[PDB]
Amino acid sequence: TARPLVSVKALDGDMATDAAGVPMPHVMKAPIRPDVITFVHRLVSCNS
Amino acid sequence: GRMFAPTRIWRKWHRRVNVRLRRVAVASALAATAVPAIVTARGHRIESVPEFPLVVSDSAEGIEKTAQAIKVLKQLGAYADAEKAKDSVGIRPGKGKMRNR
Amino acid sequence: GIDLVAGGRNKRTKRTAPKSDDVYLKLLVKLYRFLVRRTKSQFNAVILKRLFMSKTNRPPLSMRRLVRFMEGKEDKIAVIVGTITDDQRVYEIPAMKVAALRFTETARARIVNAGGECLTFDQLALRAPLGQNTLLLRGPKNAREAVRHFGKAPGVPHSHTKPYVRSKGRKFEKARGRRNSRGFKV
Amino acid sequence: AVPLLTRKIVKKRVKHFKRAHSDRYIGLKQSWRRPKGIDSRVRRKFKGCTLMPNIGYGSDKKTRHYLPNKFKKFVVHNVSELELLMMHNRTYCAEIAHNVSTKKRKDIVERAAQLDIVVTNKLARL
Amino acid sequence: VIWTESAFKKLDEVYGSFEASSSKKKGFVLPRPKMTNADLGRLINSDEVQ
Amino acid sequence: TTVPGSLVWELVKKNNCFLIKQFGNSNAKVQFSKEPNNLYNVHSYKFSGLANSKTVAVQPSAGEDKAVVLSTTKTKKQNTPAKLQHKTLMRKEFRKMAKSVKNQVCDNYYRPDLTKPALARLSAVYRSLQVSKSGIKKKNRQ
Amino acid sequence: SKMALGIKRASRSHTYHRRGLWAIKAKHGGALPKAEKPAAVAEPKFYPADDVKPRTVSTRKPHPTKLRSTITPGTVLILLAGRYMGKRVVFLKQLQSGLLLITGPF
RNA sequence: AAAUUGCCGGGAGGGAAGCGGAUGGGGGCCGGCGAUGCGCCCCGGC
RNA sequence: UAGGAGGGCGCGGCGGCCGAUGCAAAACCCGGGGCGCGAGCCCGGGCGGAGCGGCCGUCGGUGCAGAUCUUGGUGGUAGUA
Numbered sequence: 001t002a003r004p005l006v007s008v009k010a011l012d013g014d015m016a017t018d019a020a021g022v023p024m025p026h027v028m029k030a031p032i033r034p035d036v037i038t039f040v041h042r043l044v045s046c047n048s
Numbered sequence: 049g050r051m052f053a054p055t056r057i058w059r060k061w062h063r064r065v066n067v068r069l070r071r072v073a074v075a076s077a078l079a080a081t082a083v084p085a086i087v088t089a090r091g092h093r094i095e096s097v098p099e100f101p102l103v104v105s106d107s108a109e110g111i112e113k114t115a116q117a118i119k120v121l122k123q124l125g126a127y128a129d130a131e132k133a134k135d136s137v138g139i140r141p142g143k144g145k146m147r148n149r
Numbered sequence: 150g151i152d153l154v155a156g157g158r159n160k161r162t163k164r165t166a167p168k169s170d171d172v173y174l175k176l177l178v179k180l181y182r183f184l185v186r187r188t189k190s191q192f193n194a195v196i197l198k199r200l201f202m203s204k205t206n207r208p209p210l211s212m213r214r215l216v217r218f219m220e221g222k223e224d225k226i227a228v229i230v231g232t233i234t235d236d237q238r239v240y241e242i243p244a245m246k247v248a249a250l251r252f253t254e255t256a257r258a259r260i261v262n263a264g265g266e267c268l269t270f271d272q273l274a275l276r277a278p279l280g281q282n283t284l285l286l287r288g289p290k291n292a293r294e295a296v297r298h299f300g301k302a303p304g305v306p307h308s309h310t311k312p313y314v315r316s317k318g319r320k321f322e323k324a325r326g327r328r329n330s331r332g333f334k335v
Numbered sequence: 336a337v338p339l340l341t342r343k344i345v346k347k348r349v350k351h352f353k354r355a356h357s358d359r360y361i362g363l364k365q366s367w368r369r370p371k372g373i374d375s376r377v378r379r380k381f382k383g384c385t386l387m388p389n390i391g392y393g394s395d396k397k398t399r400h401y402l403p404n405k406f407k408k409f410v411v412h413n414v415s416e417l418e419l420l421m422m423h424n425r426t427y428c429a430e431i432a433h434n435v436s437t438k439k440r441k442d443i444v445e446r447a448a449q450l451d452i453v454v455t456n457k458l459a460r461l
Numbered sequence: 462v463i464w465t466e467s468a469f470k471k472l473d474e475v476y477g478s479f480e481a482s483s484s485k486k487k488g489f490v491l492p493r494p495k496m497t498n499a500d501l502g503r504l505i506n507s508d509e510v511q
Numbered sequence: 512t513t514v515p516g517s518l519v520w521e522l523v524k525k526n527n528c529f530l531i532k533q534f535g536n537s538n539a540k541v542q543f544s545k546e547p548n549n550l551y552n553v554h555s556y557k558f559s560g561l562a563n564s565k566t567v568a569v570q571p572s573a574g575e576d577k578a579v580v581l582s583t584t585k586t587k588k589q590n591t592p593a594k595l596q597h598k599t600l601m602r603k604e605f606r607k608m609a610k611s612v613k614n615q616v617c618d619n620y621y622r623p624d625l626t627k628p629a630l631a632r633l634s635a636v637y638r639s640l641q642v643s644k645s646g647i648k649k650k651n652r653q
Numbered sequence: 654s655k656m657a658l659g660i661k662r663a664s665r666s667h668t669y670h671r672r673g674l675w676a677i678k679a680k681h682g683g684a685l686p687k688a689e690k691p692a693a694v695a696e697p698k699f700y701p702a703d704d705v706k707p708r709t710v711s712t713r714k715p716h717p718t719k720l721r722s723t724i725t726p727g728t729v730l731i732l733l734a735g736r737y738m739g740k741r742v743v744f745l746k747q748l749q750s751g752l753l754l755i756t757g758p759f
Numbered sequence: 760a761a762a763u764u765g766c767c768g769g770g771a772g773g774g775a776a777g778c779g780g781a782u783g784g785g786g787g788c789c790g791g792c793g794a795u796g797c798g799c800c801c802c803g804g805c
Numbered sequence: 806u807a808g809g810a811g812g813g814c815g816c817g818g819c820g821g822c823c824g825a826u827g828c829a830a831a832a833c834c835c836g837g838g839g840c841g842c843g844a845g846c847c848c849g850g851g852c853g854g855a856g857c858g859g860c861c862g863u864c865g866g867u868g869c870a871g872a873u874c875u876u877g878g879u880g881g882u883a884g885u886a
């Protein structure tokens with residue numbers, strides 16, 4: 001039961017708020033599969 | 049004369065991918081967006097960006113102008129990568145420059 | 150000149166590496182090349198070459214068949230280089246520790262909810278670097294539909310080979326050569 | 336500037352493998368094509384006929400792709416690509432690409448001077 | 462990718478987790494890897510293997 | 512390297528923005544890597560400035576005389592690109608800078624790997640700074 | 654005697670005599686000496702990128718060149734080449750490099 | 760661009776020429792075509 | 806040989822990356838220097854005067870010596886009949 005909090009980057013003109021980091025989404029921790037990417041990228045690209 | 053095996057419009061132009069395989073590949077792509085070494089290796093100048101993933105507040109949502117957008121990229125470490133894109137624009141070598149590309 | 154067949158060179162072929170350019174399976178292979186190299190576990194040699202295998206040489210194993218094969222040996226880890234599929238026809242499953250390349254979602258839930266473990270092969274090498282206290286299992290290789298069509302031809306004596314036919318019914322591959330009233334009975 | 340190679344470069348053949356009968360026709364190119372003819376005496380390797388390339392002619396793997404300079408070449412287009420040879424200066428020699436202008440070449444030569452990088456077309460375009 | 466805070470918080474809604482019927486998408490569960498920890502350094506140089 | 516380095520090497524080995532490969536995929540292939548934290552500019556996982564959390568950089572500074580910049584990244588700041596790098600500007604003498612490089616590359620067990628390469632790149636970087644200023648004197652062919 | 658000498662040389666006893674491990678058993682008492690560890694320079698002026706390999710001052714000790722049996726001092730030699738080709742000279746002695754010392758006399 | 764042609768310069772020829780291996784003679788071309796630096800030292804300054 | 810497979814070379818687009826070019830791009834020319842067993846490739850010199858290249862993935866109207874091959878151009882025949 002723990003996951004890091006992603007710091008949100010403020011911008012000039014913002015009201016200073018007692019905010020905290022957003023926990024990391026589960027998808028941003030999914031397996032990295034470059035074979036699947038290039039297969040799907042090839043087939044999807046030809047549909048236009 | 050006519051060409052050998054004249055091209056026909058009933059070639060297989062569009063190919064299908066399983067709905068689930070599409071979703072799996074999107075998941076893998078999203079994860080890699082959160083790895084600085086891979087975002088670097090794919091050619092993005094990310095060297096003054098504070099953190100990956102790079103999350104900016106909702107106040108960006110309401111901006112209006114390209115000039116306003118430029119400040120936001122400057123306050124991040126993002127404007128340098130946008131610099132490279134604009135500086136790299138040139139005319140496409142080959143036949144495509146007369147095929148509307 | 151020296152009297153030899155093809156210069157004495159090997160003409161058989163075996164997979165020295167896997168076909169898929171899957172990054173995680175590539176990482177697993179580097180681990181087991183090291184393990185076979187330094188530990189000399191015979192178990193480790195089997196696991197390595199099974200990692201170099203095509204989808205049809207690594208058939209799935211159902212949880213019903215796995216539960217049968219584990220019965221009474223629940224102090225050991227089941228090892229399958231392949232997929233564990235869930236089986237609805239089973240009711241009793243013991244708490245069991247299973248290592249496999251993949252688990253279906255329903256299978257993994259069934260195993261965990263029994264109080265078992267769904268191990269990966271990296272995790273296995275931590276908990277058994279020499280495959281000690283393991284039950285190494287394959288699935289049924291000759292259970293595919295394609296296998297029915299293999300062997301002696303459909304129309305020779307004593308063969309029970311499945312013919313390639315586009316449909317079933319009385320009009321498809323039943324008359325001459327399949328019964329005595331129409332020519333001959335195969 | 337001093338090359339590492341400490342072994343003489345042996346070539347098993349210096350002549351090229353010209354195409355058979357390209358000396359007899361004009362529209363035949365000199366680039367090697369292996370004869371596939373049924374009666375081809377080149378293909379059947381009779382003595383006194385033109386030779387065909389084999390793997391046996393292959394040059395020693397140690398001194399392969401080394402120029403007579405005893406450096407291996409790497410073509411550069413700009414100063415940045417030159418600076419990749421900083422730590423290989425005794426094995427690799429730079430060579431400016433054929434379409435790099437005179438202005439750009441002066442820079443590469445100036446920068447290659449400091450890093451001590453052998454450059455084999457240092458006088459071109461000047 | 463530059464995520465807005467509005468969008469980065471919707472990701473868990475859109476893709477869910479390693480749990481059934483958590484995604485906004487139907488019939489989908491995030492894919493699991495073949496190797497839980499990919500660090501060949503840690504596995505090869507753990508006490509168990511050495 | 513928010514994922515392991517062994518994994519990252521798998522992804523960036525065959526293609527990435529820093530690898531300049533020439534002369535095909537035959538036995539004539541020549542390939543270098545122009546990323547700035549690769550000491551020999553070699554496309555290998557040992558020298559990769561991409562697939563390592565611990566890497567060493569030895570660079571001549573921008574327009575300035577005799578300043579060598581030494582950089583080492585931080586293992587626990589991998590996801591903070593801006594403040595991942597710890598860089599040091601040294602304009603001291605060579606043998607004194609050879610000490611600083613050992614202090615931060617070798618003696619702390621950072622990358623005992625790159626003890627020889629870091630010093631050798633310092634030797635080459637430092638000499639290029641003298642020659643830039645003093646001008647070419649020697650030819651070095653002997 | 655080529656083989657007879659060769660057999661003698663590789664004898665375990667006689668190589669001990671030849672090398673002189675006796676009289677090195679003398680100096681450093683009832684033991685055979687130890688050594689130490691040089692190369693504590695701590696002062697590299699340069700750092701080569703090639704895997705360095707240093708200069709050879711060879712310990713190999715090539716045998717001296719042989720003198721032909723009939724070249725004995727006082728014998729008259731004929732020079733076969735050089736600017737004195739055909740000249741008949743006097744053989745004095747063999748030198749350290751193996752070259753023969755000769756005189757016309759002038 | 761090539762096929763093919765003219766002029767100038769060079770080369771060889773007893774019923775073909777061209778070709779493969781050798782080398783010898785001529786040409787023509789190659790200065791990363793081929794080095795002059797490193798270690799002890801004595802000053803005289805940086 | 807017939808035949809099968811692997812690994813490469815080369816041509817033109819598309820998605821990406823990395824670059825050259827009026828301080829001279831492409832194409833073409835050369836008794837110029839080289840690399841590779843080879844397909845081919847790199848550089849020099851010239852001509853030209855505005856575009857071009859390498860790498861990863863992917864795609865195709867993608868490689869010629871023949872076909873009494875198609876079209877065009879050109880010889881010898883011959884200053885002859």
Ligand SMILES: [Mg+2]
Nearest residue numbers: 306333334335
């Ligand atoms: Mg019968």
Ligand SMILES: [Mg+2]
Nearest residue numbers: 373374375806
């Ligand atoms: Mg025949």
Ligand SMILES: [Mg+2]
Nearest residue numbers: 760761762763
């Ligand atoms: Mg012509």
Ligand SMILES: [Mg+2]
Nearest residue numbers: 767768769770
């Ligand atoms: Mg003439």
Ligand SMILES: [Mg+2]
Nearest residue numbers: 778779780781
């Ligand atoms: Mg001849």
Ligand SMILES: [Mg+2]
Nearest residue numbers: 781782783784
């Ligand atoms: Mg000759």
Ligand SMILES: [Mg+2]
Nearest residue numbers: 817818865866
């Ligand atoms: Mg086309």
Ligand SMILES: [Mg+2]
Nearest residue numbers: 051052866867
């Ligand atoms: Mg065609």
Ligand SMILES: [Mg+2]
Nearest residue numbers: 362363869870
């Ligand atoms: Mg033709």
Ligand SMILES: [Mg+2]
Nearest residue numbers: 371869870871
């Ligand atoms: Mg043909």
